[PDB]
Design a binder for this molecule. Structure first.
Ligand SMILES: *C(=O)c1nc2c(C(=O)Nc3cc(O[C@H](C)c4c(Cl)cncc4Cl)c(C#N)cn3)cn(CCN3CCOCC3)c2cc1Br
Length: 294
C-alpha cells in the first residue's frame, strides 16, 4: 500500500508484459505500454518494466522503492535510462523505464566483432569513430550524473544500454550496492567479476567518489576497444589484489590507438586527483571525435 504519485503513476492495465529481459535488485521484463504519451492514448510503445522477484523480502521492496525515488529526481538526460512511469496502486510494484532494444554495451559489441562475398568482406559492423562516440556518450551521461551527485559505484559496459538508434544509456546508477559486504570472488549470473571495475580506494578503503567512477570508466573504455572483452582477462581475483598493489595495469589492447590507451591509463592513476574528471573526459573524447575527417 504505497502512496500515490500522480505525476509518475501509470495504469498497470495499460501494460502488456512480454518476455523477461534480465535479472539482478529485482527483475526486468520487456512490455508494451499504451498511451505512455497522454496525447496518444491508444498508441503502443515498447518499454522496460522493473519489478520485484518472487523472493519479495521487504528490503528487496525498499531497495526497489529507493531506486524508484532516485529515478524520479535524477531528471532527464539522453545518455541515462530515464523513468517513464510507475505502478504502485492495487497490485505489484512496477518501475517503468526506457527500453534499449540492443541490450547492454557488452552484448552489443561482442555480437559485432569482425568476421567473403561482397566488396567489404573485411569490414565489420564496428568502426573507430562509432566506438569513440560510444565512449563519449557514456562520459557525458556520467558527467550529468556527477553534476547531480549520483555515484554509480559499478560502472561497466554491462550497465550501459544501447537503443535502436545506438544511443548509450547508463542504467542502474541509483542503487544500493552492498558496499560493505562485497564477495570479491563472486562472479555474477553472466560470469562478471565486479571487483575488476573497482577503484583502489573503493576496493581497499571502501571509499567511493566520482573519481572512483572515473577509474571504472577507464575499465569501460578497455571493454569498448576490445569489442566486449572481460577486463584483466583470465586473471584470478587473488592475483588482481596483489597486481593492483604493485601498481600494475592492463596492457594496451590490439588495434587501439595510443590516444585512447593513454586515456585508459589516466583513469587508472592511483591517486583520484591525478585522474581526469568526466568533464575533461568529455572534452578529450570530443577532440578525437572531431579529428575524424568529413
Ligand atoms: C526493449 O527496447 C528491448 N530491450 C531489450 C534488451 C534489454 O536489455 N533491454 C533493457 C534491459 C534493461 O535492464 C536489464 C536488467 C539489463 C539487461 Cl536485460 C542486460 N544488461 C543490463 C541490464 Cl541493466 C533495462 C533497464 N533498466 C532497459 N532495457 C535486450 N533486448 C534483446 C536484444 N536483441 C537480442 C537479439 O538480437 C537483437 C537484439 C531487448 C529487446 C528490446 Br525490444
Amino acid at each position: 500500500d504505497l502512496p500515490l504519485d500522480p505525476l509518475w503513476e501509470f495504469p498497470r492495465d495499460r501494460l502488456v508484459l512480454g518476455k523477461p529481459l534480465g535479472e539482478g535488485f529485482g527483475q526486468v521484463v520487456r512490455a508494451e505500454a499504451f498511451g505512455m504519451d497522454p496525447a496518444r492514448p491508444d498508441q503502443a510503445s515498447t518499454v522496460a518494466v522493473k519489478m520485484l522477484k518472487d523472493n519479495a523480502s521487504d528490503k528487496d521492496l525498499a531497495d526497489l522503492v529507493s531506486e524508484m525515488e532516485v529515478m524520479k529526481l535524477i531528471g532527464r538526460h539522453k545518455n541515462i535510462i530515464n523513468l517513464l512511469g510507475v505502478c504502485t496502486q492495487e497490485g505489484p510494484l512496477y518501475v517503468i523505464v526506457e527500453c534499449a532494444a540492443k541490450g547492454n554495451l557488452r552484448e552489443f559489441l561482442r555480437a559485432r566483432r569482425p568476421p567473403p562475398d561482397g566488396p567489404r568482406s573485411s569490414e565489420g559492423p564496428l568502426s573507430f569513430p562509432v566506438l569513440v562516440s560510444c565512449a563519449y556518450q557514456v562520459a557525458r551521461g556520467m558527467q550529468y550524473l556527477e553534476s547531480r551527485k549520483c555515484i554509480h559505484r559499478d560502472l561497466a559496459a554491462r550497465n550501459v544500454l544501447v537503443t535502436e538508434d545506438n544511443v548509450m544509456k547508463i542504467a542502474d546508477f541509483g542503487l544500493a550496492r552492498g558496499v560493505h559486504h562485497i564477495d570479491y570472488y563472486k562472479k555474477t549470473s553472466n560470469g562478471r567479476l565486479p571487483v575488476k571495475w573497482m577503484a583502489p580506494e573503493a576496493l581497499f578503503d571502501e571509499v567511493y567518489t566520482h573519481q572512483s567512477d572515473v577509474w571504472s570508466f577507464g575499465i569501460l573504455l578497455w571493454e569498448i576497444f576490445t569489442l566486449g572483452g572481460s577486463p584483466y582477462p583470465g586473471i584470478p581475483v587473488e592475483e588482481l589484489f596483489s597486481l593492483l598493489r604493485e601498481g600494475h595495469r592492463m596492457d594496451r589492447p590490439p588495434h587501439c590507438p595510443p590516444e585512447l590507451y593513454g586515456l585508459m591509463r589516466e583513469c587508472w592513476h592511483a591517486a583520484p586527483s591525478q585522474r581526469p574528471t568526466f568533464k575533461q573526459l568529455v572534452e578529450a573524447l570530443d577532440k578525437v571525435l572531431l579529428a575524424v575527417s568529413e
